[PDB]
Amino acid sequence: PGVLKIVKVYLAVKRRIQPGDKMAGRHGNKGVISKINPIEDMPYDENGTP
Amino acid sequence: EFLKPRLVDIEQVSSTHAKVTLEPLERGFGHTLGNALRRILLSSMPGCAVTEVEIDGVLHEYSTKEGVQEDILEILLNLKGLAVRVQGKDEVILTLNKSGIGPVTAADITHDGDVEIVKPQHVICHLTDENASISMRIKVQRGRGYVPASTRIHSEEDERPIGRLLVDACYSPVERIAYNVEAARVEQRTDLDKLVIEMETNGTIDPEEAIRRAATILAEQLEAFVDLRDVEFDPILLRPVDDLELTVRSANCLKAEAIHYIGDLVQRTEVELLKTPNLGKKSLTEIKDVLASRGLSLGMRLENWPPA
Amino acid sequence: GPEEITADIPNVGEAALSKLDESGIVYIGAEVTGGDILVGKVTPKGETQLTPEEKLLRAIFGEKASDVKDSSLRVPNGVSGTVIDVQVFTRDGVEKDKR
After folding, report:
1. Of B78, B72, B74, B81, nearest in space to B54 by CA
2. In chain A, what residues touch B77 (CB-CB under 8 Å)?
3. Is B138:B118 a contact under the CB 8 Å cutoff?
4. What one-character DSSP code corresponds to residue A28?
5. Contact residues for B68 (Cβ-Cβ < 8 A; gap 6+)
6. Quick one: CA dihedral B153, B154, B158, B162, positive or negative?
7. CA gap B220, B232 in Å, rounded
8. DSSP string covering chain B
9. Which of B62, B159, B162 sits opposite C27 (nearest CB)?
10. Which residues of C touch B62 (CB under 8 A)?
């Protein structure tokens, strides 16, 4: 009875990955990212796929 | 004393896969050139990728359009992978209109003057009824490296109307590159090296042009090493004092104590300028009155004083 | 009285009203960050002694003369994104919103 009108607003935000974001497998090996390396700096095998 | 490598025996496996051969090379230069060229080619290769997309009926990337099978998010993800080659332009607009049943592919996009679609079988959306139509405009640019949509703000220097869906850009055509070194077929020399580079791109850039561009970039960077050598601000201040609308008995006294700027008057603490001859208690308040009218409270502390 | 909801908000610049509709709700799809206005909700204030300064203020400015207090929902700092949906609801008997 005090209320006369109600309005509700929804926002959406796309969160990306970044150094501090926590990542883990499903064997219990957790961790925190440390550096987002550029493509050419990662180790690559004989066929060039990093 | 060193043989100069030459570009010879360039062949293409497919429209994307390519092999490039550099036959004459010395002992240690094969690996050095291979790694440097791989890093240059992967890091910074000019290319073209979709920058923004405007669809007629949508309002935001998290909406659903009636008559299509995919959400607008998936349509944007599909467009992000579009491969297009432009010539002589850098802000080219692509329009796409289609009505009917079935997949809508990149071949439907209206034929622009100088725009080549490397692959036209690239499905981007599906129309699932007879009476639904899609009409959308794609603005595609030219760039160098990965640039997220979020990190660009200069595009908001001009206000963007609602309906502009910003997408991320990649700009890098070279998806994969590997190199290898082998013993050369030259028999007159004791032993020579031959370098083979395989590159898998999106088809936007020719392999030979890529190798030439990488070599030019490396040479330009080396040009630095070829010769080493090398072996009080706000407009309110810096303003002459003869504008504060001061009294006559102040002007001569103000000039007598070498106060020619507004700022140096502010830096005078209260207890010390009262020692000035004929300053005047009522007059001093008037200086404090008109100076505080500008918001400059007496007794501020500056670091350096320019002479202008 | 009633805390009526309107687009027009006293003592707020036209820049902050760029994203407000004719009813006072952010357009669906507008991008919001920082402390942008979401809905213009004004709370009436109490005043019944028309002082001469008050009457001059009412004469030089609008009829309300900005006596209605502005209590508008705003984005808390550090929150960003694009507006997705608005789900306004009405009491029976009261005039329904345009939206």
Report:
1. B72
2. none
3. no
4. S
5. B75, B125, B126, B127, B128, B132, B134
6. negative
7. 42
8. --PPP-EEEEEESSSSEEEEEEEEE-TTHHHHHHHHHHHHHHH---EEEEEEEEESS-SSTT---TTBSS-HHHHHHHHHT--EEESS-SEEEEEEEEEEEEEEEGGGS---TTEEES-S--EEEEEEEEEEEEEEEEEEEEESS-B-TTT--GGGSSPPPTTEEE--B----EEEEEEEEEE-S--SSS--EEEEEEEEE-SSS-HHHHHHHHHHHHHHHHHHHT-------STTSS-BSTTS---HHHHHHHHHTT--BHHHHHT--HHHHTTSTT--HHHHHHHHHHHHHTT--S----S-----
9. B162
10. 82, 84
Q: In the structure encoding, which two tokens stand for residue B299, read together?
A: 């007794």
What are the angstrom distances between the C-alpha of B131 and each of B100, B103, B106? Answer: 7, 14, 21
Taking only residues 20 to 49 of chain C, the set having a beta carbon closer than 8 angstroms to any beta carbon of chain A reads 25-26, 32, 38-39
Residue tagged 């043989």 (tokens): B3
> Which of B62, B162, B164, B165 should be substituted to probe chain C, the one whose Cβ sees the most C Cβ atoms within 10 Å?
B162
CA distance B195 to B192: 10
Q: Resolution of the deposited coordinates, in angstroms?
A: 3.9
* Token reading at C60: 């030089």
